[PDB]
Amino acid sequence: PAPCYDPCEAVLVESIPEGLDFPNASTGNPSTSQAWLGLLAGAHSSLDIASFYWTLTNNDTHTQEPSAQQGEEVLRQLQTLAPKGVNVRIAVSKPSGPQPQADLQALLQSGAQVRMVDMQKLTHGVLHTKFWVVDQTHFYLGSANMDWRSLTQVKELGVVMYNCSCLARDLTKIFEAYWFLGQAGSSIPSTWPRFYDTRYNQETPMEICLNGTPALAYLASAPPPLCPSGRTPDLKALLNVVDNARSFIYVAVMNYLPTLEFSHPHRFWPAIDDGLRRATYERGVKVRLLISCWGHSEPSMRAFLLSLAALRDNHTHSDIQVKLFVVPADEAQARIPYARVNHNKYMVTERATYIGTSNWSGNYFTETAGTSLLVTQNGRGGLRSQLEAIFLRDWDSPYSHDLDTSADSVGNACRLLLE
Amino acid sequence: PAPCYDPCEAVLVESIPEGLDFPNASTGNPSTSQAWLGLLAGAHSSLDIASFYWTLTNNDTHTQEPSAQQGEEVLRQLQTLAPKGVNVRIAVSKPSGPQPQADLQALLQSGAQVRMVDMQKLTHGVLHTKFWVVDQTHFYLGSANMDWRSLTQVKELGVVMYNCSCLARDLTKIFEAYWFLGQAGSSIPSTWPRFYDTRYNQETPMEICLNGTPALAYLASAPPPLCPSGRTPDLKALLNVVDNARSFIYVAVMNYLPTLEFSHPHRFWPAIDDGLRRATYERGVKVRLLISCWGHSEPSMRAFLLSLAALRDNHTHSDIQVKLFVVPADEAQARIPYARVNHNKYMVTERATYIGTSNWSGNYFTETAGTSLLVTQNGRGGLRSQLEAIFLRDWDSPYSHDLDTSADSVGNACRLLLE
Ligand SMILES: *[C@@H]1O[C@H](CO)[C@@H](O[C@@H]2O[C@H](CO)[C@@H](O[C@@H]3O[C@H](CO[C@H]4O[C@H](CO)[C@@H](O)[C@H](O)[C@@H]4O)[C@@H](O)[C@H](O[C@H]4O[C@H](CO)[C@@H](O)[C@H](O)[C@@H]4O)[C@@H]3O)[C@H](O)[C@H]2NC(C)=O)[C@H](O)[C@H]1NC(C)=O
Ligand SMILES: *[C@@H]1O[C@H](CO)[C@@H](O[C@@H]2O[C@H](CO)[C@@H](O[C@@H]3O[C@H](CO[C@H]4O[C@H](CO)[C@@H](O)[C@H](O)[C@@H]4O)[C@@H](O)[C@H](O[C@H]4O[C@H](CO)[C@@H](O)[C@H](O)[C@@H]4O)[C@@H]3O)[C@H](O)[C@H]2NC(C)=O)[C@H](O)[C@H]1NC(C)=O
Ligand SMILES: *[C@@H]1O[C@H](CO)[C@@H](O[C@@H]2O[C@H](CO)[C@@H](O[C@@H]3O[C@H](CO)[C@@H](O)[C@H](O)[C@@H]3O)[C@H](O)[C@H]2NC(C)=O)[C@H](O)[C@H]1NC(C)=O
Ligand SMILES: *[C@@H]1O[C@H](CO)[C@@H](O[C@@H]2O[C@H](CO)[C@@H](O[C@@H]3O[C@H](CO)[C@@H](O)[C@H](O)[C@@H]3O)[C@H](O)[C@H]2NC(C)=O)[C@H](O)[C@H]1NC(C)=O
Ligand SMILES: *[C@@H]1O[C@H](CO)[C@@H](O[C@@H]2O[C@H](CO)[C@@H](O)[C@H](O)[C@H]2NC(C)=O)[C@H](O)[C@H]1NC(C)=O
Ligand SMILES: *[C@@H]1O[C@H](CO)[C@@H](O[C@@H]2O[C@H](CO)[C@@H](O)[C@H](O)[C@H]2NC(C)=O)[C@H](O)[C@H]1NC(C)=O
Ligand SMILES: *[C@@H]1O[C@H](CO)[C@@H](O)[C@H](O)[C@H]1NC(C)=O
Ligand SMILES: *[C@@H]1O[C@H](CO)[C@@H](O)[C@H](O)[C@H]1NC(C)=O
Fold first, then answer.
1. Is the bond leading into A23 cis (omega within 30 degrees of zero)?
2. Whole-angstrom distance, CA of residue B341 vs CA of residue B156
3. Is A135 annotated in the active site?
4. Is residue A131 marked as binding?
5. Using omega within 30 degrees of 0 as the cis cutoff, is the peptide bond preceding A337 cis?
6. Which residues are sugar-modified (chains A, B)?
7. Quick one: which atom of ligand 3 is closest to the CA of A11?
8. A383: nearest Cα among A358, A404, A352
9. Which of A155, A126, A138 is nearest to A370 (CA)?
10. Residue ranges covered by each domain of chain A
11. Strand B248-253 and strand B286-292: pairing?
12. Would you please indicate which residues of B are annotated as catalytic (active-site) residues?
């Protein structure tokens, strides 16, 4: 197609929970709150937000923790955009129960437009996607929800791509699909119109200038019902990175189940499981898996992880290591619900970078909405090296433990560890 | 199609090595030597044998063990059929090296016809199939080679189906394929003629009278190049039994590798591996795997077995147990090469019976020749119950050990056990 001449600059943003300290103070990345506040300050034309839920203040959480100031500050700034003329459009998954939306109603009276999307009817899933589009020039893609706990209590990772007009405009078309479906009584068309179609797929990714160095990038979405003809499915993009890896594969995802969860009877789903086994056996690829464990983790997830870590010995010449990332929690942090977990969902190889917003279960690629960014770059350094250094910081950390560790040793209440 | 009115009677024959004693003397099945000698005594019209190799006497083994008398007796009887007018046709895989054939030349001068089939060129494999066809009325299908060690030193299992003219004639067409390929300069046709075509596939198995009770049976062969249009591939038949099981799956096979062995680079082959994982997860099927370990077992096979036995806990509600069958060997038995192993290759479910002649690796269904018999029967009892009782005798035996057993404990030299 046509190349993008915009001076695209990519910044890796992550939120470090209070109490998590890394002695190797060498990465130094901006926090999600700092990036969000900077994005809101420079917004003057439009702002498109796709979110799972809105719990940006202490009222919805029904708590009195003083760590919600950063979350409240974002909400305070969001209420000032509409008066200045910024077209704020928010797509939020419709809650299952009758939960009041104090934050969304606050923005509704300010002048924003909020639309609830019934994923449970259209695709029998939810809207797990999380991204921003500011002025169609800068976009944020990551795992951070609209929580005050997502900025100070949980550990996350996202990417803010500045001054990339061509790439942000591609993300808008994904948001246009949710905006169209948010309309009451609107069903999924058999074929999407050209408006939502894209020409930058896996086969022909777009060419950008990431910090000067040329690179190839393309966006992959889910579920298929919503993907137009030119959009690469998220599972296909995920498997392509695993198939093309030749040296190593680094995966840090909160949950990994090779099963269609919720759907009963238990459906087996060996899509990503087979890709990892092929990589380590057929090729000399070393695979490192970093999974997050907390009180609400599925206990069935351990059996499928022990079945994967078993394939590592001299005879088979395979190398799979599985480690659990447990965020320590004291009594004060334990009182906050859904507050101490590692939320990062991304994959790093020796040649490609994958950053997604959906877990690695079966429903997140067939029923649940989601979006992932795939950037490849020639030569050493760049975004891939920065992301690789983050993974190694987590891997060689006191908060990452093996699968045979006693559950008392870790700071939190891990359900995947025996005794 | 048309049903078979022949009074088909099926007998399970197995060879028990010297020194192997089962206190539960309740099965009582005839030995392979007894069945073979009875088959040869009643042969008057024809005899078709498909074999891997011929080592029926002490000369080829270059040993002086007195346990080869049974093997020599079979060879002595085989030399008398041709004088009586029996048309003896033998298909034997061509040896890789220049190994002399003392047994085959002995039969050649008697009047038999011996043809060597170059599987290493036609399908880049070997002729691992093992079956007999006596007078086109009685056929033996099993794992027993033409060894004197296959009758007294190794443990095997086969089925002799008496008075089944319709079923034996179906097995002849498989032998006709090897006979056609045994001709020098004969290549695999693109489409087999009608002569080798069959009408009793998995979709429409033939109806027989197994000991009076009606039953459905069909033969499955390999590799596909040799399977005509109407012949069910062996892998498809094997996977159908696993897919249709609802209560339990009992598997006793010498080697189980989800990889295309020999073929390099290491090719992954999760065909049967995925079927077993689906059965235990999606359904409440209990899977029991009995693998044979000896000095020549592939050490890489342990990692793929530990990766399968890991999927068994309350949370996942799965039940996979893997055990190793080790035939004890003293100093005298150790001196005999390739002499102390469990050679049985069969699968038992709650509704179907599978008896095959090929291991469960990747090459035995794509390159290597092989044949399997699939018999299903309504109601309790019959062949399936007899085969199930054999498996439980092996499972609850002192010669079957778990994967964590020390390698010194077992009587033989097992390469799959640590320390
Ligand atoms: C492509 O181009 C983009 C745009 O320039 C680059 O993005 C920059 O990345 C660098 C490095 O990650 C960023 O610099 C770092 O910022 C961190 C966070 O900034 C805040 O830090 C404190 C936190 O309280 C605030 O007080 C402060 O005002 C900032 O708002 C800093 O913490 C980092 O400093 C720490 O780490 C370094 C080592 O990394 C130590 O040497 C320091 O002493 C200190 O401990 C650091 O300054 C920069 O902010 C990003 N730019 C933007 C606009 O966000 C991409 O990195 C680039 N791509 C590549 C591959 O180079
Ligand atoms: C469908 O129809 C066929 C045809 O009849 C049946 O096949 C018969 O199966 C039975 C049971 O397996 C066979 O009977 C058994 O034979 C064993 C081996 O026979 C030899 O045994 C000794 C070994 O040295 C020789 O001396 C002897 O002369 C035989 O040549 C015996 O060992 C068995 O006896 C032992 O076990 C039983 C318990 O099983 C004990 O009670 C005994 O005391 C003893 O310990 C037994 O006699 C029979 O031979 C088979 N027939 C043929 C023609 O081979 C199928 O079983 C049938 N299908 C079903 C489902 O019933
Ligand atoms: C995305 O593109 C915009 C547009 O170029 C970038 O903004 C520009 O950033 C530079 C760097 O700070 C600014 O230069 C500075 O100007 C001040 C005077 O205002 C001067 O004192 C400094 O020494 C420096 O030269 C530039 O003014 C600014 N332009 C605009 C219109 O804001 C922006 O930085 C880019 N995004 C990222 C993440 O870099
Ligand atoms: C396969 O079919 C043949 C043909 O029927 C079976 O052979 C028959 O077996 C019966 C049972 O032993 C024989 O009956 C016996 O006859 C003798 C006299 O010879 C008698 O003294 C016995 O009391 C008994 O009645 C029958 O003669 C025999 N027929 C032939 C032609 O051999 C054979 O048994 C069947 N196969 C199997 C495994 O059963
Ligand atoms: C694969 O082989 C390597 C090299 O032998 C093993 O690495 C060392 O092995 C020796 C003995 O085999 C141990 O004493 C060392 O502790 C091992 N070092 C490390 C860093 O592991 C390795 O253990 C073997 N197995 C695997 C799964 O790599
Ligand atoms: C699955 O649950 C069953 C029932 O609780 C377990 O069976 C017994 O479990 C208790 C405690 O959980 C043990 O003390 C017994 O020794 C178990 N009996 C047997 C025969 O195992 C069973 O262990 C659990 N796990 C699996 C894989 O079945
Ligand atoms: C809820 O919001 C109100 C006003 O926005 C304020 O009182 C406070 O921030 C929250 N808590 C309570 C108890 O009202
Ligand atoms: C080989 O066969 C011959 C004759 O068949 C006989 O001597 C014996 O059975 C075997 N062994 C030796 C040493 O010849």
1. no
2. 9
3. yes
4. no
5. no
6. 24, 59, 163, 211, 314
7. 38
8. A352
9. A126
10. 9-402
11. parallel
12. 128, 130, 135, 343
Say if CB B50 and CB B251 are below 8 A apart.
no
Select from B124, B147, B120, B139 the least CA-distant residue to B49: B139
Residue A197, by phi and psi: left (phi above 0), alpha (psi -120 to 50) or beta? beta
Helix pair angle (B69-81, B32-41), 10° resolution: 20
Structure tokens at B136: 């086109």
Cis peptide before B95 (omega within 30 of 0): no
The domain covering A9-402 belongs, at the CATH homologous superfamily level, to Endonuclease Chain A (3.30.870.10)
Quote the tokens at residue A71: 């979350």
CA atoms within 13 A on the CB side of B135: 16
Q: Spell out which residues of chain A touch residue B300, defining contact as CB-CB under 8 Å.
A: 313, 315-316
Q: Are B90 and B49 within 8 A, CB to CB?
A: yes
**How was it solved?**
cryo-EM
Q: Closest to A315 (Cβ–Cβ): which among B282, B299, B311?
A: B299
Q: Please tell me the distance between residue B340's alpha carbon and the centre of ligand 6 in angstroms.
A: 35
Residue A393 CB neighbour total at 10 angstroms: 14
Q: Residues B281, B274: contact at Cβ < 8 Å?
A: no
d(CA B209, CA A319): 53
Q: Considering only CA atoms, which of B68, B143, B147, B23 is closest in space to residue B399? A: B23
CATH class given for the domain over B9-199+206-402: alpha beta
> What is the crossing angle of helices A271-282 and A301-309, to 10°?
10
Do residues A219 and A373 lie in contact, with contact meaning Cβ atoms separated by under 8 Å? yes
Task: Note the resolution in Å, 1 decimal.
Answer: 2.9
The one-letter code for the residue type at B118 is: D
User: Residue type for A296, please?
Assistant: H
